[PDB]
């Protein structure tokens, strides 16, 4: 399958209550592997997956240094942006940044991204060419000019195409037992009487990884996506995911309904049928 | 591994 490494950064100002809150997290696919929290005791980048723990102090030092540079830039940005938008010093504001890279099943680069938001609204983003910038408004256009003069796009491109891919592959290798596994959903179907003429079939997929899945109901082979209740895919807390899909059927016509499950961990898609 | 050069990327 394809794989990705993604970093997420959030800075929240807290006027009169000290320095902004800053939280960073890194993922490989749907597995978190590092974090930093400005308010935690360590003031260090910290491991959140077993396989990253074998990296030595040089790495923990380097990541801590870089992550603090992220925080410091966002801290200055919160001041810059308040000024650009004529906002007072009293209110709390947010800066978010996300970047990372995808590789294909052959572990060659597919694409990179780098996006930035202020107060939850797009502000500036690198285009897919890893050369051009999308600016949301006139403030971000001034940022764009600054970033052009500093060759920011060239710096990020070399990172996304080079460093990001190298380290994603290294982590895939080191954490192969967990990251390159697929856990196929454990599936089952419950039946609940609504009344004496209808019942709810609910189709469950549990303990699966990665998070991507498709659950659909059919009736005599016809799709039913107007009459299916879905839940959003949700974390189980143990590294796996959950999802369900339900339909309200006439009682005694249960046999006409089939649940179809698509997941990377399945030889072949599943058809389930009540009983 | 995190990107370098964030000091050079102020808004």
């Amino acid at each position, epitope marked *: 399958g394809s794989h990705s490494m993604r970093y997420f950064f959030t800075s929240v100002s807290r006027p009169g209550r000290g320095e902004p809150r800053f939280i960073a997290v890194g993922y490989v696919d749907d597995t978190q592997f590092v974090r930093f929290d400005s308010d935690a005791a360590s003031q260090r980048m910290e491991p959140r997956a077993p396989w990253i723990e074998q*990296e030595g102090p*040089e790495y923990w030092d380097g990541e801590t240094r870089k992550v603090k*540079a992220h925080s410091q830039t966002h801290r200055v940005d919160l001041g810059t942006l308040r000024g650009y938008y004529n906002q007072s010093e009293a209110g709390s504001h947010t800066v978010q940044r996300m970047y990372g890279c995808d590789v294909g099943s052959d572990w060659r680069f597919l694409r990179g991204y780098h996006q930035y938001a202020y107060d939850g609204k797009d502000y500036i983003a690198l285009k897919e060419d890893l050369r051009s910038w999308t600016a949301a408004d006139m403030a971000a256009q001034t940022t764009k000019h600054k970033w052009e003069a500093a*060759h920011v796009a060239e710096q990020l491109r*070399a990172y996304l195409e*080079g460093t990001c891919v*190298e380290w994603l592959r*290294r982590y895939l290798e080191n954490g192969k037992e967990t990251l390159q596994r697929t856990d196929a959903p454990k599936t089952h179907m419950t039946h609940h009487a609504v009344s004496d003429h209808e019942a709810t079939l609910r189709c469950w997929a549990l303990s699966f990884y990665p998070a991507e899945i498709t659950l659909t109901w059919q009736r005599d082979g016809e799709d039913q996506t107007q009459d299916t209740e879905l839940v959003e895919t949700r974390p189980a807390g143990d590294g796996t995911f959950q999802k369900w899909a339900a339909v309200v059927v006439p009682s005694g016509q249960e046999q006409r309904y089939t649940c179809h499950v698509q997941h990377e961990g399945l030889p072949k898609p599943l058809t389930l049928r009540w009983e | 591994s995190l990107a370098g050069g964030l*000091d050079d990327m102020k808004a």
Partner: T-cell receptor
Amino acid sequence: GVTQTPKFRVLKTGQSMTLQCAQDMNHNSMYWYRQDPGMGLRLIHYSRWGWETAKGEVPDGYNVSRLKKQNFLLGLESAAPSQTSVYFCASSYGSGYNAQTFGPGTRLTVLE
Amino acid sequence: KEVEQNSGPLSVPEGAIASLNCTYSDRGSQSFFWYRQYSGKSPELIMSIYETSIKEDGRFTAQLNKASQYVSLLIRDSQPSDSATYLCAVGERVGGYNKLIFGAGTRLTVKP
């Protein structure tokens, strides 16, 4: 840090040898350089663990092998007087960790 | 050249300030280093710097200016034991920050 064996070697023209570089620093990137008066450090070949080795500025006459993360071997198959130099191995954590730690150096003298 | 340093050799009386400068061509460079190499020994990393700033370590001051693309090294109260070749090194952006480009080096002699 980085160790190199041997420290010194005399070869007759035409003989072969392998220089070994080892490190215990968890480094993924390893490099082999030669240093001669008037030219400074010149990269022969380098290696990123998980990738094919890459030629440097002066690869001709040398081969390399990266059988494991810890070890980077430089091979001279047919020693020539031009290969009389001081060879330095170096290691770095990987991409974006560009600080290199250098081994103590290997002096090779090739004689008729 | 991508990394350029004071040609040298450089002679300084004991007690004086030794001034070393390095210019680099890539505005996207991120990692900058100063190495010291004693005669017959291997290069040793003595300073690293990553932001426009001044960084002090004892008698050594490194200063980076990313906007003007230079990095400098000052040695205050120069000592004879500082006599060595000093090398500027920059992580190469092109290729994915995977190696160092080194300047030609400045031979410093501190006269007792």
